[PDB]
Amino acid sequence: MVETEPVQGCRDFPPEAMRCRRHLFDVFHATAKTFGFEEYDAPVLESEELYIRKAGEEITEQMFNFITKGGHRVALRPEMTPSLARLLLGKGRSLLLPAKWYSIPQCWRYERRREHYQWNMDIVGVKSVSAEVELVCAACWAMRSLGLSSKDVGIKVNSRKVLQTVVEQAGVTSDKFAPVCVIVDKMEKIPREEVEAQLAVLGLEPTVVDAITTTLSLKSIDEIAQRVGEEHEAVKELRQFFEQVEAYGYGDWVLFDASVVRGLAYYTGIVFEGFDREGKFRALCGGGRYDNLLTTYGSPTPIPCAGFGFGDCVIVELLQEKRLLPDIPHVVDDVVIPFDESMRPHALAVLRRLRDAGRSADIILDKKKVVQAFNYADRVGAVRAVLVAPEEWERGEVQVKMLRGFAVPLDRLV
Amino acid sequence: MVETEPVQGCRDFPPEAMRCRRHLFDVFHATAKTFGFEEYDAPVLESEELYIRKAGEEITEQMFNFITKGGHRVALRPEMTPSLARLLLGKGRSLLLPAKWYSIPQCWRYERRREHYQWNMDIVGVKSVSAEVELVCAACWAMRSLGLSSKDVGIKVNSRKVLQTVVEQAGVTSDKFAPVCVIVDKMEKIPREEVEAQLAVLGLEPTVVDAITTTLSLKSIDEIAQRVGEEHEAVKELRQFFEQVEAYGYGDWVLFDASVVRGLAYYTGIVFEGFDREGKFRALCGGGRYDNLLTTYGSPTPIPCAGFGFGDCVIVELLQEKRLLPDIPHVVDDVVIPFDESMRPHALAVLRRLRDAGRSADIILDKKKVVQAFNYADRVGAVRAVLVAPEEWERGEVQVKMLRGFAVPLDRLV
Ligand SMILES: *CCC(=O)Nc1ccc2c(O)cccc2c1
Ligand SMILES: *CCC(=O)Nc1ccc2c(O)cccc2c1
Numbered sequence: 001m002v003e004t005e006p007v008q009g010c011r012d013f014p015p016e017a018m019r020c021r022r023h024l025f026d027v028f029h030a031t032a033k034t035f036g037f038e039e040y041d042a043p044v045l046e047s048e049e050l051y052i053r054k055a056g057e058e059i060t061e062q063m064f065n066f067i068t069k070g071g072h073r074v075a076l077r078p079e080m081t082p083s084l085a086r087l088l089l090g091k092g093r094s095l096l097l098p099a100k101w102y103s104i105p106q107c108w109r110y111e112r113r114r115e116h117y118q119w120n121m122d123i124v125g126v127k128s129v130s131a132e133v134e135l136v137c138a139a140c141w142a143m144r145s146l147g148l149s150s151k152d153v154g155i156k157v158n159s160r161k162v163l164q165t166v167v168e169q170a171g172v173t174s175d176k177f178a179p180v181c182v183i184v185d186k187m188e189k190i191p192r193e194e195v196e197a198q199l200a201v202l203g204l205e206p207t208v209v210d211a212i213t214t215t216l217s218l219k220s221i222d223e224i225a226q227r228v229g230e231e232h233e234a235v236k237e238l239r240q241f242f243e244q245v246e247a248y249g250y251g252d253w254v255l256f257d258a259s260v261v262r263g264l265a266y267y268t269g270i271v272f273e274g275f276d277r278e279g280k281f282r283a284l285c286g287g288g289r290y291d292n293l294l295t296t297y298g299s300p301t302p303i304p305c306a307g308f309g310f311g312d313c314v315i316v317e318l319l320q321e322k323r324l325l326p327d328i329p330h331v332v333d334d335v336v337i338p339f340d341e342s343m344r345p346h347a348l349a350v351l352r353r354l355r356d357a358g359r360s361a362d363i364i365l366d367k368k369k370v371v372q373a374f375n376y377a378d379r380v381g382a383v384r385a386v387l388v389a390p391e392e393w394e395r396g397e398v399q400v401k402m403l404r405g406f407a408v409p410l411d412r413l414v
Numbered sequence: 415m416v417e418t419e420p421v422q423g424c425r426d427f428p429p430e431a432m433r434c435r436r437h438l439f440d441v442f443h444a445t446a447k448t449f450g451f452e453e454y455d456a457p458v459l460e461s462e463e464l465y466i467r468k469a470g471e472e473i474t475e476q477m478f479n480f481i482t483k484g485g486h487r488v489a490l491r492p493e494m495t496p497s498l499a500r501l502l503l504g505k506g507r508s509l510l511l512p513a514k515w516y517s518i519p520q521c522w523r524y525e526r527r528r529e530h531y532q533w534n535m536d537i538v539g540v541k542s543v544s545a546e547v548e549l550v551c552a553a554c555w556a557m558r559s560l561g562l563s564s565k566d567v568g569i570k571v572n573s574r575k576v577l578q579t580v581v582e583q584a585g586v587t588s589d590k591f592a593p594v595c596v597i598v599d600k601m602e603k604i605p606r607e608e609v610e611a612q613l614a615v616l617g618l619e620p621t622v623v624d625a626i627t628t629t630l631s632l633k634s635i636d637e638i639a640q641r642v643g644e645e646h647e648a649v650k651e652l653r654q655f656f657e658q659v660e661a662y663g664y665g666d667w668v669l670f671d672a673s674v675v676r677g678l679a680y681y682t683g684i685v686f687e688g689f690d691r692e693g694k695f696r697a698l699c700g701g702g703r704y705d706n707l708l709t710t711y712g713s714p715t716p717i718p719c720a721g722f723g724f725g726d727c728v729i730v731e732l733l734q735e736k737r738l739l740p741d742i743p744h745v746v747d748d749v750v751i752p753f754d755e756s757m758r759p760h761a762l763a764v765l766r767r768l769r770d771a772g773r774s775a776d777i778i779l780d781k782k783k784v785v786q787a788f789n790y791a792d793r794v795g796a797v798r799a800v801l802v803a804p805e806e807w808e809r810g811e812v813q814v815k816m817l818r819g820f821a822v823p824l825d826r827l828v
């Protein structure tokens with residue numbers, strides 16, 4: 001016997017499971033179309049150098065990499081954003097801006113699952129918070145389309161610029177700001193003692209550490225304004241963001257949370273993440289603005305960007321908990337049934353007619369009795385059974401039976 | 415500057431190219447639905463042992479493999495059929511038969527492209543030639559749906575059972591039959607001298623070699639019948655196959671060709687391949703019956719199977735040659751244009767309304783003048799521009815302009 005289990009940490013999607021995945025992806029595609037985003041894709045295999053950021057990111061640490069026979073260092077992508085930037089950079093100033101690009105790549109890791117699909121949505125060339133507004137509204141729209149409400153989920157929002165100021169003002173070199181965000185990102189998950197210890201190892205003293213902890217636990221935007229003024233660029237941007245989301249009609253879906261930083265080095269501005277309001281699951285999605293990445297890739301001119309990723313695993317757990325993923329059985333419009341094998345040529349002509357009319361149709365393929373053919377029709381979820389028998393055929397007719405029998409002229413079948 | 419080119423032999427699909435790929439995939443999906451096939455998928459990463467067939471197959475020789483950090487021997491799949499069989503085997507006798515499964519996996523090789531997408535269609539649990547009939551009709555239907563006709567393309571058909579008999583009758587052990595098919599598969603591509611030399615290296619003498627060459631060049635089914643009788647199972651099956659395809663209405667698309675064997679070890683019966691009738695391209699698609707594979711994987715009971723693969727590269731070259739892949743520019747229903755920034759909140763409310771009605775819509779995101787917003791609307795392929803200005807808004811109206819302006823009440827927009 002060959003090994004029937006898939007490779008470690010990887011999923012099979014036989015038809016039943018594939019229908020569930022399609023239910024999800026259909027929503028990602030449909031939301032992207034609704035919001036005017038354009039699809040793209042890139043190879044699952046990228047150069048490892050693409051991901052060397054040196055900020056202690058979990059994503060870059062857990063990289064599924066290997067060496068080709070040719071000696072080239074490659075990885076199965078841990079995320080899509082670097083691939084997106086490569087594409088954008090490759091287009092040069094022929095790229096028309098603003099650009100709104102989406103994809104649903106399988107991404108990988110090695111440490112538990114080693115693969116997941118991740119809906120990616122990115123707006124490129126837009127400096128203002130309107131980009132983040134649209135992105136967050138798109139994530140809410142996807143969740144609403146799956147049957148969830150603002151009672152089930154929300155999106156927590158913050159800006160890294162608040163922390164940027166505190167870190168700069170405390171005398172810390174800005175090369176440590178990204179590593180700091182990575183550490184601070186672990187705040188909720190591990191003990192405060194341990195997070196402070198990690199900040200200590202970076203070469204930051206207790207005073208600096210205190211200033212960071214205090215700002216992360218500020219519970220409102222007015223309180224941020226007290227620490228940094230009402231006209232600190234982050235205050236205006238957040239307020240603008242909330243005003244715009246409210247005008248769009250998703251005000252009940254979003255809220256401020258000063259503890260949201262995200263785990264990736266490249267975010268520079270607004271950051272956000274989706275969560276379930278029962279506090280049972282990990283983040284549903286996550287993103288933010290990353291205005292410097294393209295500059296760090298060698299873009300001659302800075303290109304503002306913002307986007308998010310939205311994984312396939314947590315959302316499904318949530319939807320299952322809420323009873324929003326019932327199995328949808330397979331369906332087919334018609335099952336054509338030869339009365340016997342001598343009727344097969346005629347039944348094939350009928351099959352052609354039905355498909356020509358845009359219907360989905362099967363024909364009984366092997367030899368079986370009429371009753372078993374009706375049972376098969378039921379099992380495959382046929383709406384209609386079309387029996388092709390000698391006597392009806394002589395009359396220019398077939399027998400039609402709605403499954404969820406009467407003689408009908410061929411032409412009236414469709 | 416980071417490297418903008420993708421990894422060697424791999425394609426990027428920015429929006430323009432992705433639209434072309436979607437045009438193709440939409441056809442594969444739509445054909446599969448028309449023919450009652452169900453989608454599945456499996457991991458791109460499979461155990462290398464899955465592909466060790468030892469028949470000198472090009473497909474297994476050019477395997478993109480590597481070793482995980484954990485020491486496990488894996489490959490990026492060279493083809494899908496072994497993954498399909500693994501899935502089928504895993505289901506046991508809970509799998510309901512007949513099963514008709516399809517997928518569009520990216521498959522890989524290492525030697526020129528190193529990746530391609532390949533539409534796979536397989537019928538499982540069907541012993542009779544009706545399976546091959548449906549599969550071939552499905553491939554013709556996909557090609558017709560892309561704009562091709564039986565004047566452009568055909569499908570060449572044969573059965574390996576003819577050759578099986580000749581090889582058996584000549585005293586050759588049946589363990590050499592598969593390696594022989596692999597060699598004979600190269601007949602058209604390399605010199606007859608070289609093919610005979612390869613057969614010689616396997617330990618077959620000139621007499622045996624002659625018997626094979628003669629049968630491959632027989633130009634009709636009557637001639638096959640002379641070599642092996644009219645009632646040799648292969649004769650009845652082929653005739654049944656052609657009668658059924660003719661009754662379905664695709665008789666002009668298909669023909670007999672005794673030189674078609676295919677390059678894979680596992681085919682046991684009918685084999686086929688698509689070709690362009692100008693003789694300019696490689697095979698468009700290829701498949702056949704493989705009734706023993708599941709037995710060789712350790713299935714306790716034999717499971718008949720048949721299917722094909724249909725790559726994304728050759729078909730596109732053909733469609734390009736025929737002028738059947740014009741660029742389809744991006745479109746969007748509405749572009750909502752704030753008259754100025756003070757109108758942004760109202761324009762967002764309008765944007766929500768439009769999307770709520772099922773329309774695809776953008777809003778101008780950054781700050782720009784109305785004329786530039788109309789230019790952007792034109793560039794993104796907007797059908798309609800919706801201008802949100804103060805004076806119309808006071809009247810409960812917006813301005814609508816069909817792009818391929820008049821005041822309209824909000825409610826009448828949709
Ligand atoms: C539901 C559990 C979860 O989401 N799993 C998960 C998270 C992140 C991943 C990355 O980044 C890569 C591959 C697979 C996963 C899986
Ligand atoms: C159009 C050229 C062609 O079809 N290229 C091609 C053939 C076969 C492949 C396999 O089997 C794996 C990966 C990539 C290709 C590409």
Ligand SMILES: N[C@@H](Cc1c[nH]c[nH+]1)C(=O)O
Pocket residue numbers: 079080081120121122264286287288290306307308309
């Ligand atoms: N790549 C990020 C999500 C993202 C997309 N665009 C910007 N951010 C992640 O994996 O979490």
Ligand SMILES: N[C@@H](Cc1c[nH]c[nH+]1)C(=O)O
Pocket residue numbers: 493494495534535536678700701702704720721722723
């Ligand atoms: N796997 C075959 C095609 C096929 C699918 N099913 C049966 N045959 C190929 O790569 O050519």
